[PDB]
Each structure stands twice: as C-alpha cells, then as structure tokens.
C-alpha cells in the first residue's frame, strides 16, 4: 500500500520515491508530476535522516557500552 | 568512428610483442660504468655500487603472449556475424 | 499485465545509464549504480542480469551499462568502490537545508552522500569528542593535498611542514598522518571540498 | 521478510501467558509486541540487502565486526536473545534439572550448588545491569560455566560485543585491564575483517529489558522477576542446549 | 552416529572435533531462533522444490528472468511471434506464450516418462550440471553436460555401443539378467531430448531430426524455433531461468514416473 | 524533598503526555526506588545536592552507585521539569499505536509546532536558528536522536563553555552526565596508570596523541556543557501508556509539551 | 626522485580508490589520454588566419578528419576556407 513509503520486504530506495509519486498522481492528491515528486522526495529525506541517526546513535551506544 | 571488419578466416597477431624486463645485472653494470666515467675508475664516490654488482652477479652473470590463443577462442563470440 | 510487471521489475528500476565504465577524468560522485548479489547467487553466477556473469569474477559488486550487446558480452566492471567512500564519510562524522521544505537536474544539496544534521557531537568513553581525527596520506610536495578516507582534501597547516616531508620528497604518500577535518562543504558540481589540519 | 516465530501452545500463552512469571498482558508486551517490533525493524533495515537471507543469529555473527551497522546487529541480537529467553520460560515443549548440568554448575562454580548460584545471578543482575539488559549463563570452550551480563542488546557468543562493561559511569581498573587484553586479542588476528574465534554458547537467558517485567512487576522489584524466571524455567530446553 | 571419535576427559578442554559437534548441535537447534524467513529466494530450492506446471504464474516466470531475451542487435527475425517488445536494448519474451509452451512441454515430458521412455537432458554451459543431474535422477532419465559427441545418435554403434546396458522391470527394478552380445550392441535411442542451450548444440538437434527423436529446447531470441518439436520461449543464458524451467520439466517427469509406478503397484 | 516537583501530583495527570498510572509509574515509583537505593548506598547524599554528589563521587569504582543513582534522579528531574503538557487528546483515551506506526513516515521535515518564539522566547529560538539552522532541523535532530536510543537514556540540549559560545545536542546512557568535566580524560588517565603498572610489574604514544586530540580544545584543554533541556528515551516513561510501537507518539507529544521559558531560564547569557 | 609521469596526482575534491595509487592507474590514464565543433560555419572563418592555422600542421598541411574530428560537412568547409585563405594572400 503506497499511502506510505516504507514497505515490509522492500528496501528504502529511489524507486520507492517514484512509486509514491505515481500513487500520489493516480489518487489525484496532487495534480502535477513535479508536486508529487517533491512531496515523495521530502518524505524520503525524512526517512533517510531517521535511518542515519539510528546508525550514528547505535555506533555511539556500542562504544558507550564497551 | 567504429569500423567493423568482415567475417575473417582468423583473428591473429603476426608478431606478438612481449615485455621482457631488462636484466638487473646489465643495468647495474651500466650504472657502474657511468660512475667510473664521471668520477673516475676506482673512484671513492661510487665504490659502494661496485659491492652491489659483486653480489648481484656472484651466483650468475645474468641471474609468453597469449593474445592469439584468446583471440582465436573468443572470435566466434565477439565477431558479431549474422545468424544462420 | 506483463508490461506493468516489467515496468516495476528491478532491472527496470535501474535508471538508464550509458556513461563510459572506464573513466579517466575527474571523479566527484558515483556515476553507475552498484549491483550487489548474495553469496549463494554468486556461487551460481546469478546477478539478476540477463546472462550469467563469468565465474572468474569473485567480487559481489559490479557496475554495468548493457544487459546484452552485439558481442554477446555483458558490458560491466567488477567494482563496488564508491559505497565505501560514502560509508567512510559516515565514519568521519563531519556534517555538511534543501532536505527541508519544470524538472531541474542540479545536484540537490548533498546528493545522498550524507543526510546528517550539523548540530550534534560525539560522546566517547574518554568523553565528549571535541574534534574528529582520521588518518590520511599527504600526496605531493606543493596548498598541500591529502587522500583521507576516499576523498581528496586540501590540508591547512600549523606553522611549518614536518621535516619528514622534506626528507621523503615524492615518497611522502607512503607514510600515514593524522588529520582533523576542519570543515566539509559541497560545491555546485558535486565535489566535496573538505579542509583538514595535519596534527 | 523476517516473521515472528510461532510458539507452541500459543492460544494458552495468549490466554494467560507464561505461568508464575508473566500475565497475559505482560507476555503480549515481551513477545507478541516486542518481537514483532524487532522483526519489523530488522526487515526494514536489511531488506534489499544480502542479510535478508540470513537468520538473526547468522546476521549478528556476520555483523558483529562492522561499526556502522551496529543497529542491525542490535536488532538481530535482541531478536535472537528474546526468543532464547522465551524458550527457557515456555510452560512446555514438571521438568527437572539434569544431572550433567548440576555437575557442571558444581564443578564450574567452585563447588557451589545451583540455588546459591541462582542467588548470585540475581545479585549480578541487580548490581551491574542498570536498566535494560540481558543475563546469561554461558559455557566456554573449557567446559566451564559462568554468568555473563550484557547492557542493552549484547550477545554472549562474540566477546568483543558482550557489552558487559558500562563505560557511561566509571570503570574499575581491573575492568580496564580486561578491556585492554580483549582489544589485544582482537588485534592479534591476521584476518582483514578482524574476526576472532569465540565458542561461548548461552545455556540460560533472562530478559532484563523493561518490556519483560515493568507491567507485571513495576519500576523496582526486577530481582523478584529474575528469581521467578529462574525458579520456573523449562529445563528440557536448557538441558538440550548443553552438549555431551 | 559419529564412530571412531574419542571424547576428551572432563578435566581437559574441548577438542576441535568436540567443538565441531557442539556447534553442530547448537546449529540444528538454536541457531535458527528469532525469526522465520519468508518470501526470500534461495537458489538451491529451484532445483529441489520446483513448482508443478499448473501452479506457475507469469509473475513466477518473470522473477526467474525467463522474459529477458537477447540483444536487439542479435535478433533472429524468425522469433518475432514470441517477443512482447524491446526494453533497455534487449528483446522481452512474451511470458504468456512461454507459459503455454512450457505447460505443453511439461505434459510431453510427463507422458514420455509415464510410458517408460528414455529422457535425455543435454546442457553444456558452465554451471548446468547440478540441475541436469537432479532432473535425470528424479525422472529416472539420463543427462549430458560435458560435451555432446557428434554422431552419438546417427553413429551410436561407434560411440555408445561399448557401454553396458541393463534389463529392468515395469517398476524400474534391476532384473540382473544376462544380455546377449547382440542385445548389448543395439542402439538405445532417447525417446525425448531436452536441450538447455540449443544454439550451441546444433549437432544434437540435427541428429534428433535425422533419427526422429522429438526434442524440447529453450528458444531464446537468437535461436531457431523450427529446429525443435516443442520450443519453450525463454532466457537460456541465465542459470536461474534455465534451472526453473528444467525443474518444472523434471517435476512433470517425476509425476509421470510416480503415476506409472502407482499403476504398476495396483 | 527537592526530588519531587510542584507541577506533578500523586493521582493527578500531566495533560496529553501521561495518564494517572503513567505519571505514577514513571515519576513517583521511580523516584521512590531511586532515592531508596541512593540513600542506602550513601546516607550523606541527603545533605548534598545531586550535582555536588556527581562532581565529588565521580571517577571511583567503589563509589559508583552513588553517581549512578544521583545522575539518574537528577536527569529524570531535569527532563520532567521543562514539561507543561499539551492540548492534544489524552494518551489514555487514544487507542494505542500498533505495528502500522513503524510504517508511517515522519513529518518532522515539513512541519513545526510549539515554536519557542510564539510564547515569547525570542532569544532561545534565535540561538537555535543560529547554531542548528532552523527549528525544523533542531526538532528533527532531537527527536531522531532520542528515538534511536535503544534502552535507557536521555537526549540533551546543551551550551558550551557564565556565557556560551555555541549550542549542541547530546546523548547520555544509563545514568550518564551531560556536563563533560566530570568524565573527561578518564580513559587516558587509566591508560597511563595501567602502563605504569605494567612496566612496574609505542602504541600508547600514538594512541595518546589521538586521545588528547579528541578532547583538546581552543583557548583551553577542558570543556564544559550547560544542560538546557532533556528528554527521556527510557521505556519506563512511555511503555506503560503508549506501548511498544508508540515511542514516536510519545516524543512528538513531549515536544508539544515543552515549555521554553524554563529552558530560557537555563540559557547562559551569550558570548 | 619520482619522475612526474611515474606519479599519479589525484585532483582536489575528487574521490578515489586504492587502485589509484598504482602504476596500473597511470597506464590506464595514458591509454585513454573547438569553435568549428560548436555549430559554426568554417567558411565564415576565411579571413581569420589564426583559427584556420589551429587546424594545420607546422608546414601548413590540412589535418585529416581523423585528426581534427570534425564532421564531413564542417571538414569540407574548413578545407575550403583554408584554401581560400591561401589564395587571397592571407595565411
Ligand atoms: Mg542465449
């Protein structure tokens, strides 16, 4: 279900961004290709920032605990 | 631009050229000769180099191309001939 | 239908790329997608491509242009280097906003290299990491440039170069040094200009 | 897609949970909610990679030596350890401790009997594991048992990732010495990955994470939960885990 | 279980072999704890757990890469009808036609095996030996993967006449009856020949044509469909697709063999 | 005692963030247990404040439990002090978030709520824009940092060293200390002391250059941090009410529950 | 010291791999070592001896299309312009 970018059994990649763009246009939540592409891009940025923070914090915790 | 050869009987280099490496003894000899040419024979400056030569040639004075094979093996695959 | 599935197939997911695989010009960012295969599929030469990759290849990463060609070869290269550079950047910790709120082709901010945010510092058992130190190699006798963790940077000195530099000359790259990354910025063309200091 | 393993007697465990340790609501938190959470996070982290094809134990063994994917390791570790924990508290596959395990505890712990060893493990868990953690009884290559504790998500198998020392606070100089010899052991290996051999295996596993006990036992009284876990273990699994 | 193994004394530490057995016991019990892997492709299963012909979908064929045809520059125009289109410089094979042809060929293999005929699996590319051997073993058939000797069928006396032959019952049970020299020297001809790489096995196809041996093959975009009795449009250069199709055919043959044995045991 | 705060009451809620049971277990039971342990380990902690205890009792393995429980209590108090509650619906009434929460995407890059400047906290928001780009970035970074904490820990806003030169965001784990001068140089100290022992009974020099560098600073070798805000990543606060999958809901409600006037009170002037 | 041709210089800001610090990289770089290609009319450059001289040898021989790399159209116009320049007294 492409109401959200992350799918179980799938990685988080650019193809997810294009798939969300097509889902947005199909449901006509947004009209133009550029708008849906930008919205999916910003969701992608948020998710990737969250993953980067998890990785950094996990490494820091590992060094914190010996 | 790209040039496409016709269907050829073979794909072979007439004279494959191999990179034989010049013997270490020969180049050391040349360096010693240039040393004695500039500083002089039995000069104090480059006498150390002589020692190296005395070792390098002590045991012995002086101490392969597969292009045709691979070309013949691969020609049928890469020639790009039309089907039949 | 078959067309829809082919449109959503992973081979279709790889964007059309036709740049020269062997490139001798300046390299600022990745130009080919890295294709990864699991060890089990590597054992059987299955990479998800049209044809089986030769068994000579032992690496699990490659970058490719054509699924098939007139010469009946897959146009590929057994290289997966660039990811490591990206990952190595994550080890440096230096942060680099367009990621916050007709088609334009400019590189948007950092084009996937780093999605970190500037305002954070690293805690360590010794204590707060004030300044990040990474090892690198000074390349030439010139400012001076250093290969540090997959990227070339210009090193900002502190008084005079160590005499080791003058003694070694052009063999300088043989010896490792420890640098502190002063700053990281991204130029418009995609180059990552980092300034570091030789400790 | 990593999926929550099916458990025997799942309907009964939903109805009541593990007897004399957890209620039904607590067992939902520890397993049905936390294991699903961990598995979903691992699937999101490892999907589209090689690691989707490997089990959590093989994932953590693979990923132990690489700093930047510790998160994956953590998830994998938990996904393994939690299941181990659950299996030693399942009602059944009363089970009795085996003669071999009793002999090993008697020989391993300087002649001490099993119950005072249980109390010692309670003391260790109360003392060193501040907050979230795991407790294990593990056997090394010398056929010797001993008690190990890991902070947050740590693994008994690989000693570099044991996470048995909390550096957020101070450390005893002996702990620093242990860390330094451990790092020397790691560095001695000629392998590029830096891997080292460790044949340690967990015979007993106890979940000290707040998901296990907080709802049933409160912020305090964790040692009460540990005692209840140790008293009413499923000894068939524990006996099987030991090799003879 | 593990004979000729000398355990160690309790005082001394584990031995290397004791450690190996200890870790094996751990692996078979506890190493697989934490999650169950689902919806993940494991190559070996394609050989050992092939699907039945009726359970095959277009999605399953596309996942195996069967649709990926040769480069458009190497097109054999006689294969026009099997092509769905071209995409990224290669021709795409129409997987519905592939499904129909594959079901037909699987029925052919099942019928031939159910009749007790000889089925020969010929494939001479690099890593095809495993699937060929497994298909032959589960269909009680025969296989060749090293090299097809020209004249194996048209010159059988000079090639295959020296190797030993065997009389068997309806249940494929050895009878151990002594064969006469004339019986041993007869040609034994395959009833069905399946070729994984028909482009590199023109000799086998021509021999089957001359000897009236019906043949199946995987017909890629650059292969001639009319050289075989039962073509299967699909990718022949990917080991996954070849193994998928071969496993389907082998399972059909195994089903035919099982039906034959069941009828003979009633 | 100083542990308990006036804006929390037994049997009364914190609107939006905790229920009655949630606040009870998170705060009152936790402080009861923590003060019991702290007073048991040392009776003298009653007289001295928590910060003085942390400073005096640090760097000693024997006196560890004192610093551990002092830091736990102090950080819990610091985290809860900035709270004010939020208008959003009570956590008790809302159905608990389930597995779908994992699949939902954050909006922390396209939204901003509870901005400090609207209440009138102009200087704090100005400084956050100055050092963290924008409040969108600050909120994203803080919540991502605290989300990533696997177990017990806190995410802190801090200021350098009373005047600050620059602001930063920190993480502390299982009763860590936000300020740095208590623990700085401990590993180098033990390394030198261990080498002295080992010789009494060079990798050390190369590693010592890096050790000094990691904590070496400009205009001084010792660096200190003023705490300004703290969030709690521990399951104790949020597991009871929101559940396993509800940490993000907890953190967003916490963010809406921040009063920035208390944070400004902690703000140390300016360079 | 190391002769410059024997040393590989990584430019500033460029990524690299360990292979770059190798003689193989130098050999590969060696192996793979204007206006008239910009849509302009070479015939218009017939009273401009310098730009025409860019496309001739030291002796004044017009360079082959293999050397210039121009299109056949622009190659013909360049040859015509060079010959015209020769005829009119320029070049
Ligand atoms: Mg083919």
Swiss-Prot record, chain C:
Keywords of the record: Mitochondrion, Phosphoprotein, Ribonucleoprotein, Ribosomal protein
Note: Present with 656 molecules/cell in log phase SD medium.
Name of this chain's protein: Small ribosomal subunit protein bS1m
Localisation per UniProt entry: Mitochondrion
InterPro entries the UniProt entry points to: Rbsml_bS1m-like (IPR016712)
Assembly and interaction partners: Component of the mitochondrial small ribosomal subunit (mt-SSU). Mature yeast 74S mitochondrial ribosomes consist of a small (37S) and a large (54S) subunit. The 37S small subunit contains a 15S ribosomal RNA (15S mt-rRNA) and 34 different proteins. The 54S large subunit contains a 21S rRNA (21S mt-rRNA) and 46 different proteins.
Organism: Saccharomyces cerevisiae (strain ATCC 204508 / S288c) (Baker's yeast)
Gene Ontology annotations of biological process type: mitochondrial translation; mitochondrial translational initiation
Record GO cellular component, one term: mitochondrial small ribosomal subunit
Domain of life: Eukaryota
Pfam family, one: Mit_ribos_Mrp51
Function: Component of the mitochondrial ribosome (mitoribosome), a dedicated translation machinery responsible for the synthesis of mitochondrial genome-encoded proteins, including at least some of the essential transmembrane subunits of the mitochondrial respiratory chain. The mitoribosomes are attached to the mitochondrial inner membrane and translation products are cotranslationally integrated into the membrane. bS1m functionally interacts with the 5'-UTR of mitochondrial mRNAs.
UniProtKB/Swiss-Prot annotation, chain E:
Keywords: Mitochondrion, Ribonucleoprotein, Ribosomal protein, Transit peptide
Coarse class of the protein's main subcellular location: mitochondrion
Gene Ontology biological process terms, A to Z: mitochondrial translation
Function summary: Component of the mitochondrial ribosome (mitoribosome), a dedicated translation machinery responsible for the synthesis of mitochondrial genome-encoded proteins, including at least some of the essential transmembrane subunits of the mitochondrial respiratory chain. The mitoribosomes are attached to the mitochondrial inner membrane and translation products are cotranslationally integrated into the membrane.
Family assignment from sequence similarity: Belongs to the universal ribosomal protein uS2 family.
Further comment found in the protein's record: Present with 6890 molecules/cell in log phase SD medium.
The protein's name in its UniProt record: Small ribosomal subunit protein uS2m
Organism of this sequence: Saccharomyces cerevisiae (strain ATCC 204508 / S288c)
Taxon lineage: Eukaryota, Fungi, Dikarya, Ascomycota, Saccharomycotina
Gene from which the chain derives: MRP4
Swiss-Prot record, chain F:
Any single GO BP term: mitochondrial translation
Signal peptide per UniProt: none
Domain of life, source organism: Eukaryota
Subcellular location: Mitochondrion
Chief location: mitochondrion
SUPFAM superfamilies listed in its UniProt record: Fe,Mn superoxide dismutase (SOD), C-terminal domain
Annotated function: Component of the mitochondrial ribosome (mitoribosome), a dedicated translation machinery responsible for the synthesis of mitochondrial genome-encoded proteins, including at least some of the essential transmembrane subunits of the mitochondrial respiratory chain. The mitoribosomes are attached to the mitochondrial inner membrane and translation products are cotranslationally integrated into the membrane.
Family: Belongs to the mitochondrion-specific ribosomal protein mS43 family.
Official protein name in the record: Small ribosomal subunit protein mS43
Gene: MRP1
Swiss-Prot record, chain G:
Keyword Transit peptide listed: yes
Major localisation: mitochondrion
Residues of the full protein shown: 40 to 138 of 138
GO CC term, one of those recorded: mitochondrial inner membrane
Segments crossing the lipid bilayer: none
Additional comment: Present with 1210 molecules/cell in log phase SD medium.
Keyword Metal-binding: no
Protein name listed in UniProt: Small ribosomal subunit protein bS18m
Keywords for the protein's UniProt record, in alphabetical order: Mitochondrion, Ribonucleoprotein, Ribosomal protein, Transit peptide
Subunit relationships: Component of the mitochondrial small ribosomal subunit (mt-SSU). Mature yeast 74S mitochondrial ribosomes consist of a small (37S) and a large (54S) subunit. The 37S small subunit contains a 15S ribosomal RNA (15S mt-rRNA) and 34 different proteins. The 54S large subunit contains a 21S rRNA (21S mt-rRNA) and 46 different proteins.
Family (UniProt): Belongs to the bacterial ribosomal protein bS18 family.
Record localization: Mitochondrion
GO molecular function: small ribosomal subunit rRNA binding; structural constituent of ribosome
Alphabetical GO biological process terms: mitochondrial translation; translation
Described purpose of this protein according to its UniProt entry: Component of the mitochondrial ribosome (mitoribosome), a dedicated translation machinery responsible for the synthesis of mitochondrial genome-encoded proteins, including at least some of the essential transmembrane subunits of the mitochondrial respiratory chain. The mitoribosomes are attached to the mitochondrial inner membrane and translation products are cotranslationally integrated into the membrane.
């Amino acid at each position: 279900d492409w109401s959200h970018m992350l799918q179980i059994g799938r990685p988080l990649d650019g193809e997810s961004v294009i798939q969300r763009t097509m889902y947005l246009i199909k449901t006509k939540q947004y009209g133009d290709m550029v708008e849906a592409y930008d919205h999916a891009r910003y969701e992608f940025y948020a998710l990737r920032m969250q993953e980067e923070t998890e990785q950094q914090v996990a490494l820091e915790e590992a060094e914190m605990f010996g | 631009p790209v040039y496409r050869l016709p269907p050829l009987p073979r794909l072979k280099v007439k004279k494959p050229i191999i990179r034989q490496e010049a013997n270490k003894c020969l180049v050391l000899m040349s360096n010693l000769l240039q040393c004695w040419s500039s500083y002089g024979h039995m000069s104090p400056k480059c006498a150390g180099l002589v020692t190296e030569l005395k070792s390098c040639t002590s045991e012995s004075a002086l101490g392969k191309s597969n292009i045709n094979y691979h070309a013949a093996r691969l020609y049928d695959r890469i020639n790009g001939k039309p089907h039949d | 239908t078959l067309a829809e599935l082919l449109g959503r197939s992973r081979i279709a997911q790889v964007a059309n790329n036709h740049k020269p695989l062997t490139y001798t010009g300046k390299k600022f960012h990745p130009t080919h997608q890295i294709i990864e295969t699991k060890p089990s599929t590597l054992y059987r030469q299955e990479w998800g491509l049209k044809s089986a990759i030769p068994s000579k290849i032992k690496s699990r990463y490659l970058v490719y242009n054509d699924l098939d060609t007139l010469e009946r070869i897959t146009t590929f290269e057994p290289r997966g280097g660039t990811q490591w550079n990206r990952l190595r950047f994550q080890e440096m910790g230096v942060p680099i906003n367009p990621f916050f709120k007709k088609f334009n082709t400019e590189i948007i901010g950092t084009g996937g290299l780093s999605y970190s945010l500037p305002g954070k510092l690293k805690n360590s058992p010794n204590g707060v990491i004030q300044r990040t130190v990474v090892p690198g190699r000074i390349l030439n006798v010139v400012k001076w440039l250093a290969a540090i963790g997959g990227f070339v940077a210009d090193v900002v000195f502190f008084q005079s170069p160590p005499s080791s530099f003058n003694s070694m000359g052009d063999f300088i790259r043989m010896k490792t040094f420890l640098f502190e990354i002063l700053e990281a910025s991204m130029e418009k063309n995609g180059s990552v200009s980092m300034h570091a200091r030789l400790l | 897609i990593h999926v929550v393993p099916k458990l025997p007697n799942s309907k009964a465990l939903l109805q009541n949970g593990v007897p004399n340790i957890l209620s039904s609501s607590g067992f939902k938190t520890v397993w049905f909610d936390y294991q699903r959470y961990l598995c979903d996070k691992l699937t999101l982290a490892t999907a589209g990679q090689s690691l989707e094809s490997y089990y959590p134990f093989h994932i953590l063994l693979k990923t132990a030596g690489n700093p930047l994917q510790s998160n994956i390791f953590n998830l994998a570790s938990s996904i393994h350890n939690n299941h181990l924990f659950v299996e030693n508290i399942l009602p059944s596959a009363k089970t009795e401790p085996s003669r071999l395990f009793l002999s090993k505890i008697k020989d391993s712990f300087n002649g001490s009997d099993w119950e005072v060893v249980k109390e010692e493990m309670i003391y260790r868990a109360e003392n060193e594991v501040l907050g979230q953690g795991w407790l294990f009884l593990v056997e090394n290559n010398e056929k010797k048992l001993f008690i190990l504790t890991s902070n947050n998500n740590g693994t008994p198998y690989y000693f570099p990732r044991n996470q048995s020392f909390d550096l957020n606070s101070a450390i005893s100089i002996d702990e620093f010495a242990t860390l330094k010899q451990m790092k020397e052991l790691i560095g001695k290996s000629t392998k590029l990955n830096g891997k080292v051999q460790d044949w340690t295996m967990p015979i007993i596993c106890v979940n000290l994470w707040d998901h296990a006990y907080l709802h049933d036992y409160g912020v305090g009284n964790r040692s009460k939960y540990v005692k209840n876990v140790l008293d009413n273990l499923n000894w068939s699994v524990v006996n099987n885990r030991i090799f003879s | 279980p593990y004979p000729n193994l000398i355990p160690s004394a309790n005082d001394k530490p584990y031995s290397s072999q004791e450690l190996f057995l200890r870790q094996l016991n751990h692996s078979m019990r506890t190493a697989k704890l934490g999650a169950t892997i689902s919806k993940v492709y494991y190559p070996h299963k394609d050989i050992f757990y092939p699907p039945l012909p009726e359970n095959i979908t277009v999605e399953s064929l596309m996942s195996a890469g069967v649709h990926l045809g040769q480069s458009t520059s190497l097109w054999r125009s006689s294969t026009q009808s099997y092509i769905y289109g071209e995409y990224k410089g290669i021709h795409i094979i129409d997987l519905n036609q592939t499904l129909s042809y594959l079901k037909r060929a699987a029925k052919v293999v099942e019928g031939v095996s159910e009749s007790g005929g000889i089925i020969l699996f010929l494939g001479t590319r690099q890593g095809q030996k495993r699937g060929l051997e497994e298909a032959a073993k589960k269909t009680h058939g025969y296989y060749v993967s090293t090299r097809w000797i020209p004249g194996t069928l048209t010159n059988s006396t000079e090639i295959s006449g020296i190797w030993e032959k065997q009389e068997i019952d309806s249940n494929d049970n050895p009878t151990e009856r002594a064969l006469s020299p004339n019986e041993t020297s007869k040609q034994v001809k395959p009833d069905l020949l399946v070729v994984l790489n028909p482009t590199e096995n023109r000799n086998a196809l021509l021999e089957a044509i001359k000897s009236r041996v019906p043949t199946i093959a995987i017909i890629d975009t650059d292969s001639e469909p009319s050289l075989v009795t039962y073509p299967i449009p699909g990718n022949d250069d990917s080991l996954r697709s070849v193994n998928f199709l071969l496993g389907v055919l082998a399972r059909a043959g195994q089903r035919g063999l099982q039906n034959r044995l069941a009828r003979n045991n009633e | 005692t100083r542990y308990a705060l006036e804006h929390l009451k037994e049997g009364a809620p914190l609107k939006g963030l905790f229920s009655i049971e949630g606040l009870q277990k998170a705060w009152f039971d936790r402080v009861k247990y923590l003060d019991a342990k702290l007073n048991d380990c040392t009776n003298e902690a009653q007289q001295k404040p928590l910060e003085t205890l942390i400073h005096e009792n640090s760097k000693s393995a024997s006196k560890k439990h004192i610093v551990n429980y002092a830091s736990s209590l102090y950080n819990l108090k610091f985290s809860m002090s900035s709270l004010q509650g939020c208008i959003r619906t009570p956590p008790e009434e809302c159905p608990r978030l389930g597995p779908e929460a994992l699949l939902q995407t954050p909006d922390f890059n396209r939204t901003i709520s509870n901005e400090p400047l609207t209440t009138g906290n102009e200087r704090l928001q100005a400084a956050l824009i100055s050092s963290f780009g924008s409040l969108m970035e600050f909120r994203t970074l803080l919540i991502n940092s605290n989300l990533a904490i696997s177990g017990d820990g806190f995410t802190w806003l801090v200021a350098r060293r009373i005047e600050y030169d620059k602001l930063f965001i920190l993480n502390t784990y299982n009763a860590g200390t936000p300020f740095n001068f208590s623990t700085s140089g401990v590993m180098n100290e033990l390394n030198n002391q261990y080498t002295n022992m080992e010789k009494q009974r060079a990798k050390q020099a190369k590693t010592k250059f890096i050790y000094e560098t990691q904590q070496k600073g400009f205009s001084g070798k010792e660096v200190s941090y003023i705490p300004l805000l703290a969030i709690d990543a521990s399951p104790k606060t949020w597991l009871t009410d929101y559940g396993v999958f509800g940490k993000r809901e907890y953190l967003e409600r916490v963010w809406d529950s921040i009063e920035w006037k208390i944070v400004e009170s902690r703000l140390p002037q300016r360079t | 010291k190391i002769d410059q041709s024997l040393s590989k210089k990584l430019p500033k800001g460029t990524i690299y791999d360990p292979f770059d610090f190798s003689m193989g990289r130098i050999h590969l770089d060696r192996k793979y070592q204007d206006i008239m290609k910009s849509g302009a009319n070479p015939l218009e450059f017939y009273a401009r001896p310098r730009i025409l001289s860019r496309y001739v040898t030291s002796t004044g021989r017009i360079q082959h299309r293999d050397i210039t790399g121009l299109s056949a159209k622009n190659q013909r116009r360049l040859s015509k312009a060079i010959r015209r320049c020769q005829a009119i007294g320029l070049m």
